[PDB]
Amino acid sequence: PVYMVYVSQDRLTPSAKHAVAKAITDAHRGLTGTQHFLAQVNFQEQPAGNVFLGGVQQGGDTIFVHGLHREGRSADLKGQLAQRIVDDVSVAAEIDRKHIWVYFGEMPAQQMVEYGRFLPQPGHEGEWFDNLSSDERAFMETNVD
Amino acid sequence: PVYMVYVSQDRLTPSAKHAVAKAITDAHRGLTGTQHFLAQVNFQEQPAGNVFLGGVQQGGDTIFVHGLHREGRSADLKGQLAQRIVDDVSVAAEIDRKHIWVYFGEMPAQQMVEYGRFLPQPGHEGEWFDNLSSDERAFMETNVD
Amino acid sequence: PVYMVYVSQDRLTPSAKHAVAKAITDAHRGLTGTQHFLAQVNFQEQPAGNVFLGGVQQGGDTIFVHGLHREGRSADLKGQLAQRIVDDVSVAAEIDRKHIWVYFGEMPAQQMVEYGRFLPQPGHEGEWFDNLSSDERAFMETNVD
């Protein structure tokens, strides 16, 4: 997956970012089985005041998570995952849950590429990982916390 | 909804941003009936020069709106809403319609969370809001212009 | 289309940005027939360290391309397009392919607007372009590289 995480500049220190990104990553791994290194968290910071709700300018406590996933998972599991992202980002960023917005979009695995390679259907990430070159396997596996 | 609004840095003063957010939020409410405070406008600023059309670097005028909605509305209503965002953002930002691009993407409501809660189906914002607790009812009410 | 390109600050100079935008636009035109001026490449730069892979903070070399397209193309064509984007951005940005992520999302053409006008169905771009006003055509034609 790619999780784009929209936040205000300086609301999250680098350690708070590490905390948020590891909580989203753990959630995704623990609920889907997808290996840690296939999950990107991509922080998009903007000056405070660029977020409006009902037309009202917000301080720096708004978080929007846009998760981009392969098709194939159940509504039940995606609900559980969205809920766990809300809870665990609330703890990790010390931000009340009421500030957190989370949207999941889905695409055919055949039109998504990570590390320059096409993804597989969910649940066949193991033999997909095994199919590819030793250099790629090594580069991927360094990307696990 | 979340309306991601990509603009060049300093193209919109604080007052212009407020006006543009208001045009989008009032368009969404007026055509869908969804409450104002459920509409987010999230401005994403980047230096002029980061937008390319047909390979040609642009100045600071382009505006891209990526509206992210719940599934369930007709093509006709989405067309009316996109055209209204075009017209009203053209007015609010004193910008020619030819500079404005609008894309709507849709997601199951069961995988969309606002204010830490799962959204209802479109049109059921009323009972949804009537099952919300008093504090989150009030917090939501503070986000109306 | 709109190609949202997420890169670290300064990883692409203005000239490298122009090259990448050209690689993507040429690939889209070559494989779909869609005229150059209908392809937007929108660079989103963030400070290095905002990308995490498997929870591990990254340097400045990751590139994520989020391409937003009209529905209607084959899985085969979209695979060819995405692969060519990996390859040609690899060359233009002088970057290892294993740094390049590419996701394609699709929307009904009836909810996509470019230059203030609703897009046609894929493969009807010539006819659509002919039926625009001459001021709109002329503005679009200025965007060809």
User: What secondary structure letter does DSSP report for B113?
Assistant: E
B25-28: long-range pairs with CB below 8 Å, 24+ = B25/A52, B25/A54, B25/A55, B25/B145, B26/A55, B26/B88, B27/B81, B27/B84, B27/B85, B27/B88, B28/B1, B28/B3, B28/B81
β-strand pairing of B100-107 with C112-114: antiparallel
SS3 of residue B117 by DSSP = strand
* CB C47, CB C6: distance < 8 Å: no
State which approach was used to obtain the coordinates. Answer: X-ray
CA distance B109 to B94: 34
Q: Nearest by CB to B40, from A49, A53, A97: name it.
A: A53
**Test the A interface: residue of B32, B113, B135 with most A CBs within 10 Å:** B113
- For residue B97, the chain C residue with the least C-alpha distance is C116
Task: Give the Cβ contact number of residue A78 at 10 Å.
Answer: 20
Distance from CA of B31 to the nearest CA of C (A): 15
Cβ of A49 under 8 Å from any chain B Cβ?
yes
β-strand pairing of C2-8 with C40-46: parallel
CB contact under 8 A, A118 and C79: yes
CB contact under 8 A, C64 and A40: yes
Alpha helices, H only, chain B? 14-32, 75-92, 125-130, 134-142
CB contact under 8 A, C55 and A144: yes
CA distance C69 to A91: 36
Paired with B51 in beta bridges are: C42
CB contact under 8 A, B144 and A56: yes
Paired with C113 in beta bridges are: B102, C118
Cβ of A59 under 8 Å from any chain B Cβ?
no
Taking contacts as CB-CB distances below 8 angstroms, the residues of chain A near B145 are 54-56
Taking contacts as CB-CB distances below 8 angstroms, the residues of chain B near C69 are none
Q: Which residues contact B143 (CB under 8 A, 6 or more apart)?
A: A53, A54, A55, A56, B36, B37
Residue type, C144: V
Question: Residue A126 is encoded by which pair of tokens?
Answer: 């193991």
- HEC secondary structure over chain A: CEEEEEEECCCCCHHHHHHHHHHHHHHHHHHHCCCHHHCEEEEEEECCCCEEECCEECCCCCEEEEEEEECCCCHHHHHHHHHHHHHHHHHHCCCCHHHEEEEEEEECHHHEEECCEECCCCCCHHHHHHHCCHHHHHHHHCCCC
User: What secondary structure letter does DSSP report for B70?
Assistant: E
The CA–CA distances, whole Å, from C74 to A108, C20, C122 equal 12, 25, 11
Matching CATH number, B2-142, of 3.20.20.70, 1.10.10.10, 3.30.429.10, 3.90.1150.10: 3.30.429.10
- HEC secondary structure over C9-46: CCCCCHHHHHHHHHHHHHHHHHHHCCCHHHCEEEEEEE
Task: Give the Cβ contact number of residue A126 at 10 Å.
Answer: 11
Paired with A40 in beta bridges are: A2, C53
Cβ of B104 under 8 Å from any chain C Cβ?
yes
CB contact under 8 A, B62 and C40: yes
Q: Which residues contact B106 (CB under 8 A, 6 or more apart)?
A: B68, B69, B70, B71, C107
The count of CB pairs under 8 A between chains A and C is 115
Question: Residue A54 is encoded by which pair of tokens?
Answer: 């009902």
**Test the C interface: residue of B24, B52, B62, B64 with most C CBs within 10 Å:** B52
Residue type, A33: G
What string of DSSP letters covers C96-119?
A: -GGGEEEEEEEE-GGGEEETTEE-
Nearest to B16 by CA among B64, B97, B88: B88
Number of H helices, E strands in chain B: 4, 8
Nearest to C111 by CA among C71, C76, C138: C71
Nearest to C52 by CA among A90, A62, A5: A5
Sheet holding C56-57, edge to edge: B117-118, B112-114, A100-107, A63-70, A2-8, A40-46, C51-53, C56-57
Taking contacts as CB-CB distances below 8 angstroms, the residues of chain B near A96 are 116
| Positive or negative: CA dihedral C59, C20, B67, B61 | positive
Query: Where do we find the tokens 């300093």?
Result: B10
Paired with A41 in beta bridges are: A3, C52
Resolution in angstroms comes to 2.0
- With vertex at residue C103, the alpha carbon angle to CA C79 and CA B27, rounded to the nearest 5 degrees, is 125
Query: Where do we find the tokens 């009972």?
Result: B127
Paired with A104 in beta bridges are: A67
* CB B70, CB B119: distance < 8 Å: yes
CATH classification (class only), A2-141: alpha beta
